[PDB]
Amino acid sequence: DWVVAPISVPENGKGPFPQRLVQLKSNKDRDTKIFYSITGPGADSPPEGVFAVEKETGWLLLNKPLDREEIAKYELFGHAVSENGASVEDPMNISIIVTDQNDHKPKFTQDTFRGSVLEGVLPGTSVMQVTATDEDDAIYTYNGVVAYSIHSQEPKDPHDLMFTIHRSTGTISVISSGLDREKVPEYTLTIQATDMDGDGSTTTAVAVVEILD
Amino acid sequence: DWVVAPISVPENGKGPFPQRLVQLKSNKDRDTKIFYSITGPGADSPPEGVFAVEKETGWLLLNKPLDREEIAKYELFGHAVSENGASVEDPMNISIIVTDQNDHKPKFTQDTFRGSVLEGVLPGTSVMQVTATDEDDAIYTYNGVVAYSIHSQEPKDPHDLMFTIHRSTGTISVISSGLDREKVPEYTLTIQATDMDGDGSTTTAVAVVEILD
Ligand SMILES: [Ca+2]
Ligand SMILES: [Ca+2]
Ligand SMILES: [Ca+2]
Ligand SMILES: [Ca+2]
Ligand code: NI
Ligand code: NI
């Protein structure tokens, strides 16, 4: 028959391996005996032997769990060969698409972000913008989508939270009145980024805000 | 004379090291032979041995190049001890301030951004935002300030550049007529982010735009 629909595999699949993906078959196996094999990156080029084929049965096998962030798509070729050594098919393209899981934590682009704002700005004024990246996919899944939060502030004067953060952009803004350099010239905000848009894992950094006159 | 003003040191200084910063001195050295030492993160707590003090002469020394993106300020303490082993001064606070150099290039938050726009929108309409960050300081210097540009667009139908990008926000916008899914369902925009507000180094990424019905 000798076509294969593109194959979709979720990354970091649980064992046991190997695991069967599809059974290769050439209809000319009624004539004589056939040996199946595969080539391409993932098969006979680096990384070597992620995939294999059982030569007699024809089972395309995956031998180890995939990681989408190393490699997202594999293009292999299928080969059928008689016992006498004749290629009985044109080599068949086999496509394997690797689909995303949340195997990565978000990671702030810096351990500390600094900012400064004039003491007399109106509530609602932007101070600075923090950023956390995430290797997982952010286009078709939430695994790469960061939500931002302020865990805590020090000191807590005048009151508990002088600031807020935009949950998607990481822009930090003044939400209350009464910033005053003489009184409190600097704040330390413990910031957090949580992937799967708020429902996943969390990473922590700090933002240090300078109050200017 | 047991006082020291804040010392500023530009990061990634060239050798040779070690480098003299300031000479510590107790006035009580006219009565006894004095030994000088330093404590604090950077001195005897991690990262250890970044700074030392010459025991006899009193010279505070920097032993290696600093990196502001690791540590921006060190708080250390100076000590003065008589040859007989007694403490002759209250320990002295010594602040080191690390000032910025442009040792980082901008990095895109991902290698590929994706967005869409309806083929009917008027020119000037926002399509998508791309983001790059720069670990270098952007409050006191231009080393962390990113300017965004569009290098090239593919394909060039109807014409060379259907899109523009806002220089500072990374918002990509439609600037020209002729979008038409049937003729061109997708554009690949090669995008660039440049530090020193356009005069420094450039990183590149790619933004793909789906034109929608
Ligand atoms: Ca993730
Ligand atoms: Ca992933
Ligand atoms: Ca830079
Ligand atoms: Ca720097
Ligand atoms: Ni990884
Ligand atoms: Ni660095």
Q: Is B70 exposed, middle or buried (0-12, 13-18, 19+ CB in 10 A)?
A: exposed
Interface membership of B73 toward A (CB under 8 Å): no
Q: Tell me how close the Cα of A132 comes to any Cα of chain B, in angstroms.
A: 8
Number of neighbours of residue B79 by Cβ within 10 angstroms: 19
Interface membership of A55 toward B (CB under 8 Å): no
Backbone angles phi, psi at B177, to 5 degrees: -80, 165
Q: Cβ contacts (< 8 Å) between B110 and chain A: which residues?
A: 133, 138, 144
Give the resolution value in Å. 2.3
Token readout for A184 is 């409190």
Residue A48 CB contacts under 8 Å (≥ 6 apart), including other chains: none
The DSSP annotation for B106-168 comes to -EESSSEEEEEEETTPPTT-EEEE--EE-SS-SSS-STT--EEEEEEEES-SS-S-SEEE-TT
Count Cα atoms within 13 angstroms, Cβ side, for A120: 1
Q: Tell me how close the Cα of A10 comes to any Cα of chain B, in angstroms.
A: 21
| Contact across the interface for A138 and B107, Cβ inside 8 Å | no
Residue type, B156: K
CATH class as words, domain B3-101: mainly beta
Residue of A nearest to B112 (CA): A139
- What is the phi-psi region of residue B124: left when phi exceeds 0, alpha when psi lies from -120 to 50, beta otherwise? left
- The CATH number of the domain covering residues in A102-213: 2.60.40.60
How far is the CA of B43 from the CAs of A202, B6, B57, in angstroms?
33, 16, 17
Token readout for B156 is 């060039």
Which sequence spans correspond to the domains of chain B? 3-101, 102-213
Asked if the domains at A3-101 and A102-213 fall in one CATH topology, the answer is: yes
Number of neighbours of residue B160 by Cβ within 10 angstroms: 10
Q: Are B121 and B178 in contact (CB under 8 A)?
A: no
- What is the phi-psi region of residue A117: left when phi exceeds 0, alpha when psi lies from -120 to 50, beta otherwise? beta
CA angle, corner A192, sides to B138 and B76, nearest 5? 60
* Residue among A116, A89, A74 at smallest CA distance from A210: A116
CA angle, corner B72, sides to A192 and A180, nearest 5? 70
The DSSP annotation for A146-170 comes to -EEEEEEEES--SSS-SEEE-TTT-
Alpha carbon distance, N-terminus to C-terminus of chain A: 77
Experimental method: X-ray
Q: Which of A73, A133, A188 to mutate to test the interface with B (most CBs of B within 10 A)?
A: A133
Q: Distance between CA B175 and CA B36 in Å, rounded?
A: 67
Token readout for A40 is 């391409």
